[PDB]
Design a protein around this nucleic acid. Structure first.
Lengths: 145, 158, 24, 78, 129
RNA sequence: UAACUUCGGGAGAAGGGGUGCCUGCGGGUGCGUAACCCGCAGGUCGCAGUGACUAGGGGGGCCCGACUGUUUAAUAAAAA
RNA sequence: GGUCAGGUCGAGCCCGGGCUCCGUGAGGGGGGAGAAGUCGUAACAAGGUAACCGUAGGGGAACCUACGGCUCGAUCACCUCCU
RNA sequence: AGUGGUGGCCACUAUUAUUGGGCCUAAAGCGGCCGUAGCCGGGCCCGUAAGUCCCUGGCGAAAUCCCACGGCUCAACCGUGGGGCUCGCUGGGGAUACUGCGGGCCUUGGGACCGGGAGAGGCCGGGGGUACCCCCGGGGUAGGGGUGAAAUCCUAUAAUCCCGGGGGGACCGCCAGUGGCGAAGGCGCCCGGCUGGAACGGGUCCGACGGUGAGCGCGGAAGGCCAGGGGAGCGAACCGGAUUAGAUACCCGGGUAGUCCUGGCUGUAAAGGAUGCGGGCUAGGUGUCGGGCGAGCUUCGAGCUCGCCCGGUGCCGUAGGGAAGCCGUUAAGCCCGCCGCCUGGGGAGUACGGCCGCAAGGCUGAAACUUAAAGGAAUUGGCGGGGGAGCACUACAAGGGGUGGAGCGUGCGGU
RNA sequence: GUGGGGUAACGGCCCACCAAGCCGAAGAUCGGUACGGGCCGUGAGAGCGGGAGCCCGGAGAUGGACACUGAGACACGGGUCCA
């Protein structure tokens, strides 16, 4: 070859080669460690509730346009700061401050985001445990709040 | 052939004689030719230089092909004959010459200092001798208890 | 470009070792 | 690590005591005696070096029995 | 240096055939070469073969039919059981019915079908198609 | 035994533990059991065994001068 | 069961050191985003100063000069290859 | 009677390559060697049967899984039988191709020997000239110098200019070639001694001593660091001048370390063939360097040349390979053994710790976060104070009139 | 290593004496994480991922320490005691 331990009893050499190089994938290293868990604020969980600290809006990037409605939350789960994107059409009536808001991830932990958002990885599904997404739709429950 | 170890070029294209049928164009016997080897060894010739002589003078193709066997040691030619007589030391002539050069070099580097090229060559000759010796000690060409270090080298030379 | 990165790093290191040397 | 400076302590300043430690170490050594071929050459006095074995006293450098100044005189040829 | 000589002897034979040369001169020279040549010759995938006996360097001169497209050896020379003969023939090789997965057994060199008939494998030596 | 380090040092850092007396042994030196030195074991008293006398409290940070030395004999021994 | 002498198992408390993780602090460094502000015009054609590089000093910045290397080098760059 | 969302895991993903991936240019060859551990071993024989294959027998609980049939309306499911189960362990008998080991053997690999020969290989000493510079003397006036133009600057008891002499440092135009030598970094005046390596022909010698090689060890341009010496010219810093809006820069006048030599020390490179090392094998042609060999020519010297042969460096090109450009016996071709290394981009070659270094630095070496691209080759087009060539009168030159002045006419901006 | 104690019993388990060995790069020691197995999830396979109901074996019962009765506990709804 141009490379390898091909010998009969050489196999430990080969097995280590592969073992070191496997670590070169971030996604493999994260998951075995628990670095994934620690980094995401929900702690590897699907959702967590928290209290809306204040309503802030974030700016659109250079390709795009649009001023997005958002909540800065303090999780009741832990004691950390999260930024969570709130949808809704006329969004702000539906969403409410200092009530309990429940935040979920979106789109995987790919680390990327949409263009209209400078860096928000998170979704607000629920406000007072009734979805925002019901209020977007006209066919299940038409606007409320 | 071809191998590289202190050159960036291949080895020479020379080969052994294939007159592997016994001589009959020689007109000297085995007996006369042995007689010559004792006298020449005694004179001051080393065993490579004897065999070269034998090919030119006495006209044999190879000294492997007029005198193998006649004693029961491996690869029977000159120094095995001598070895049974006690005219050859056990340390191969090959090794005797390598060792002699390895002494010669320390003495020049001293007197001539600032030799980079010659210094790398002293490391290289020595290194090769340890590897050759490591096989010989086992084979019985050298004693088991022998070691090759550079002080022992100087001893042999002197 | 190429010059920039390296000298910046060498500045970054010498300031850090300065801030390490005089606050121990 | 010290060559011979460690008697002095931490004192005199690193560079000077490093230099002294090297130069004296070399100074103590045996050196070629082209007289006998036996050597034990020591510095008796200032610019004086003497071999114990042959009783010979001869002039030398400050750290060698030969001087680099002296070699230049040799090198020029008559 | 010269190590694993057999793989090399097969490898020369492949290059010859890719060119479509009439013959091959095998510099390596063994019992292994000649028994493998006899197996090749029974199948009639090679033609007639000469061994000159020289002790300077034995030579084999091989006729090429061109019926061997590729023939090479195994990198580990990992061992092979009787149940396992099929597994290696489908897996690696394009063949399915060509009947040579050359294996060495206690008798010499055998093919695939010949290994079944006897009932004996050994270490997997190489392949031929 | 720490920070620090010019690898010398910091260091006796810091901090812990034992130590009397009697009775039986061992090693070492010697010379023939004389002359000595250094340990061990068992027994055992008091509140306390360096019991008296003798006999350093320790640690870090900052400033200055590197150091040892010298200075206003006799108000000033220092950052001079 | 009393009280006490000798020996063993032996927590809990206290003291100091070692190791390992978490929270956190004036002040300070860079990073990814932002829209608009500020200076120059460096790089991309040769960008009107061909560029890179290791090393060394200096510059408000893009950078510049010295030395040696390199062309992934400008060019009809013409001992020569190129012409 | 679910559908849909988020989070995670497995497939898709040959994005972990054993099946089933790579390293000229896409990410990736270690600056090079040495030899340790380890991995791997030519031919022939022989002993063992450890590895390796076969057979029998002990056993790997039930459940889970498949197939079959049956029961519950049916089916899921469960029963029953058969088959299989992480299936890692055990004992005896046999075989000996292949492997391991012990012994014997052979020259095919490896190292070694001898003779002609070439060389900018290394170490030392001697020495020549060219050119610069300084100083002495002669000669000889008014500008020299510098540039794209300039300016600073330099010069009158005299610079530049021109001759003769002495001293000094440094280096070697021609020679010099697509050329030669060294492991690599690299190596160029000429002469001599000392010394290392190589191609080659003759295998004369040991007889598998072999290959690779984690670690380790060692060399390592330039500059730098330390000491000493040397200093003619050159020139970071630096001090003016110009250019430029300003120059921070290109340009010019001065100028220090340094450049040189020795002793010592550190270690980097686009240290490139961006192509790890060793071997076998796979179309050729031509030139060239040195060797061997047979000739012709001959100034009778391999001086000029041809072929065979051996090694090396180049051009063109086959099979094949490559994304393509290319590569192609000097492989990116076909194989084998081993080492080093990569797995999107930025954060970052940073942080933190350790290790080395005198420092500068070197080695190792993250994470939070953010992103839908980063990259390679070619195609086509535009473009370029990029190169070459050529035309045009709605181009420029030549030439003749005119606008911008004034007043008016007319349109527009503004008001 | 030698003798001995104690246990249901082997044993540096514990003890006296005597020696200076034992272990390591085929990764010791240290930090960190984790009941293990039958199986299961996925994948054509190779492989990857997993230890959940359930069965099998061990471990625990506020944290720690302690004995007695019993073939069997140092004892999951027993006692003593400390936090």
């Amino acid at each position: 070859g141009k490379k390898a331990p091909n010998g009969e009893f050489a196999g430990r050499k080969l097995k280590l080669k592969r073992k070191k190089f496997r670590w070169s994938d971030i996604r493999y290293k994260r998951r075995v460690l628990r670095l994934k868990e620690k980094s995401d604020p929900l702690e590897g969980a699907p959702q967590a509730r928290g209290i809306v600290l204040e309503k802030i809006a974030v700016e659109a990037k250079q390709p795009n346009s649009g001023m997005r409605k958002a909540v800065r939350v303090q999780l009741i789960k832990n004691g950390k700061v999260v930024t969570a994107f709130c949808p809704g059409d006329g969004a702000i009536k539906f969403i409410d401050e200092h009530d309990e808001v429940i935040i979920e991830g979106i789109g995987g932990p790919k680390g990327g985001s949409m263009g209209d958002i400078p860096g928000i990885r998170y979704k607000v599904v629920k406000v007072n445990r009734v979805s925002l997404k019901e209020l977007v739709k006209g066919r299940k429950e038409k606007p409320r709040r | 052939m071809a191998r590289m170890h202190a050159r960036k070029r291949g080895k020479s294209g020379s080969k052994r004689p294939p007159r592997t049928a016994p001589p009959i164009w020689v007109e000297y016997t085995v007996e006369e030719i042995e007689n010559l080897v004792v006298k020449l060894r005694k004179e001051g010739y080393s065993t490579a230089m004897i065999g070269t002589i034998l090919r030119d003078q006495y006209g044999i193709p190879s000294v492997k092909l007029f005198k193998d066997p006649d004693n029961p040691n491996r690869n029977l030619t000159i120094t095995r004959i001598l070895e049974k007589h006690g005219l050859a030391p056990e340390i191969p002539e090959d090794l005797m010459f390598l060792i002699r050069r390895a002494v010669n070099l320390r003495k020049h580097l001293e007197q001539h200092p600032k030799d980079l090229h010659s210094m790398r060559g002293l490391q290289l000759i020595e290194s090769k001798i340890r590897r050759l010796v490591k096989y010989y000690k086992r084979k019985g060409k050298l004693p088991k208890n022998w070691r090759y270090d550079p002080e022992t080298a100087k001893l042999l030379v002197r | 470009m190429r010059w920039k990165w390296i000298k910046k790093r060498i500045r970054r290191l010498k300031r850090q070792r300065k801030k390490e040397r005089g606050l121990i | 690590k010290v060559g011979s400076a460690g008697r002095f302590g931490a004192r005199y300043g690193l560079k000077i005591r490093r230099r002294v430690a090297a130069v004296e170490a070399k100074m103590r050594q045996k050196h070629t005696c082209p007289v006998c071929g036996r050597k034990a050459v020591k510095r008796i006095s200032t610019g004086i070096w003497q071999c114990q074995k042959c009783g010979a006293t001869f002039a030398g450098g400050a750290y060698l029995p030969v001087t680099p100044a002296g070699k230049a005189v040799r090198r020029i040829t008559e | 240096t010269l190590l694993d000589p057999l793989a090399n002897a097969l490898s020369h034979i492949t290059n010859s055939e890719r060119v479509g040369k009439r013959e091959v001169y095998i510099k390596p020279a063994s019992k292994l070469i000649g028994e493998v040549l006899r197996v090749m010759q029974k199948y009639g995938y090679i033609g007639e073969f000469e061994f000159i006996d020289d002790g300077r360097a034995g030579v084999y001169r091989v006729q090429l039919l061109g019926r061997i497209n590729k023939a090479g050896a195994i990198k580990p020379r990992f061992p092979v059981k009787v149940s396992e003969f099929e597994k290696w023939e489908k897996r690696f090789l394009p063949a399915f019915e060509f009947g040579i997965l050359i294996v060495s057994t206690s008798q010499g060199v055998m093919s695939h079908k010949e290994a079944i008939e006897k009932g004996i494998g050994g270490r997997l030596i190489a392949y031929v198609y």
